[PDB]
Design an enzyme around this catalytic site. Sequence first.
Site, short mmCIF file in Angstrom:
data_model
loop_
_atom_site.label_atom_id
_atom_site.label_comp_id
_atom_site.label_asym_id
_atom_site.label_seq_id
_atom_site.Cartn_x
_atom_site.Cartn_y
_atom_site.Cartn_z
CG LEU A 201 -14.34 -11.73 -5.11
CD1 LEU A 201 -15.51 -12.01 -4.15
CD2 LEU A 201 -14.65 -10.45 -6.31
CB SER B 140 -5.47 -14.05 -1.43
OG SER B 140 -4.23 -13.69 -1.78
CG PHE C 185 -8.74 -12.18 4.19
CD1 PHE C 185 -9.06 -12.80 3.15
CD2 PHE C 185 -8.15 -10.72 3.99
CE1 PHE C 185 -8.82 -12.13 1.42
CE2 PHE C 185 -8.05 -10.08 2.81
CZ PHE C 185 -8.37 -10.84 1.56
N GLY C 186 -6.93 -15.16 4.17
CA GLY C 186 -7.07 -16.48 3.49
C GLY C 186 -7.01 -15.92 1.71
CB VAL D 254 -12.09 -14.23 -0.52
CG1 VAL D 254 -13.66 -14.11 -0.54
CG2 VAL D 254 -11.96 -14.14 0.93
CE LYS E 278 -12.01 -16.56 6.04
NZ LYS E 278 -10.88 -15.73 6.90
CG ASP F 202 -9.15 -5.76 11.78
OD1 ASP F 202 -8.48 -4.85 12.14
OD2 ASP F 202 -8.86 -6.54 10.72
C1 LIG Z 1 -12.77 -12.36 5.63
C2 LIG Z 1 -13.98 -12.99 5.30
C3 LIG Z 1 -14.81 -12.49 4.20
C4 LIG Z 1 -14.14 -11.67 3.30
N1 LIG Z 1 -14.71 -11.08 2.20
C5 LIG Z 1 -16.10 -11.18 1.43
C6 LIG Z 1 -17.43 -11.87 2.11
N2 LIG Z 1 -18.30 -11.39 1.18
C7 LIG Z 1 -17.87 -10.66 0.24
N3 LIG Z 1 -18.53 -10.26 -0.86
C8 LIG Z 1 -17.85 -9.45 -1.66
C9 LIG Z 1 -16.27 -9.07 -1.59
C10 LIG Z 1 -15.57 -9.64 -0.58
C11 LIG Z 1 -16.57 -10.54 0.40
C12 LIG Z 1 -13.12 -10.92 3.55
C13 LIG Z 1 -12.19 -11.32 4.68
#
Ligand SMILES: c1ccc(Nc2c[nH]c3ncccc23)cc1
Length: 273
Positions: free
Chosen positions: A12, A14, A17-18, A20, A35, A135
């Site tokens: 989805l 990157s 945050f890593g 995902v 993640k 944040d």
């Molecule tokens: C840090 C932790 C989680 C996310 N994304 C998401 C968690 N759940 C989601 N569902 C849809 C899209 C993105 C995410 C991003 C940064």
Amino acid sequence: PLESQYQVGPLLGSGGFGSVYSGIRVSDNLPVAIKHVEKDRISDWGELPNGTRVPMEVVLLKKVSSGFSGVIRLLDWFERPDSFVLILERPEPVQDLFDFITERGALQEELARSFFWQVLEAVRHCHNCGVLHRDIKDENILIDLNRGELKLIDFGSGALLKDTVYTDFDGTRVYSPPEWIRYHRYHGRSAAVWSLGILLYDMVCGDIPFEHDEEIIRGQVFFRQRVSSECQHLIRWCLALRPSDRPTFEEIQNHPWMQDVLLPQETAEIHLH
Ligand SMILES: c1ccc(Nc2c[nH]c3ncccc23)cc1
């Protein structure tokens, strides 16, 4: 039994945050986000009550998961030799608020009011749980497009809530308060309210008010879009230069502009469907 409880879908996103991934919990077909964070790339470390070394992010996420649903919940986590893997809830269909504003521009005040209200409830939940997000911005807010419900994500810049001064900050600078810029000192709640004023301006104007340090410190707010006097008042209050001049969460939610909020589903039916 291992990570094999999950089926991995498309990436989805990157970044800091890593990485995902979309995924599915095999057992009950529940949509999940997976993640991955490299160990070598984690700055903030905490400890579980159990007595295990984990990313601070896991500690915070654990403290805020429970019945309330204004935050994306941590369902599970795994330790690999070189990384941590976090299993998080995934709304579907979903769009983050940054992409929503990019596509639709400045939000009508009724919609902004519904979204801002839900963000307030989520941040209040975090603080009640002893967690400061640090944040809050449109990129860290997800919209469940079908239910009109907003969800806070990314606690990777977060901290345990405390009543003393913070002298460290790793969140987004353009959402950070003048006291951080000038003195490298802030208190949790007033800094959060500052970031909420930036977010509210962002919703009703279609962009954040400040780009540069100088503009943050000057604290003068210009509106580029037609925005009601009541909404402008609330924004300017949240963006008071002196931290003690900012409203509490109770004061924000009791503000004239925040009255008669729509329910999430109502919001979706009027604005999202
Ligand atoms: C840090 C932790 C989680 C996310 N994304 C998401 C968690 N759940 C989601 N569902 C849809 C899209 C993105 C995410 C991003 C940064």
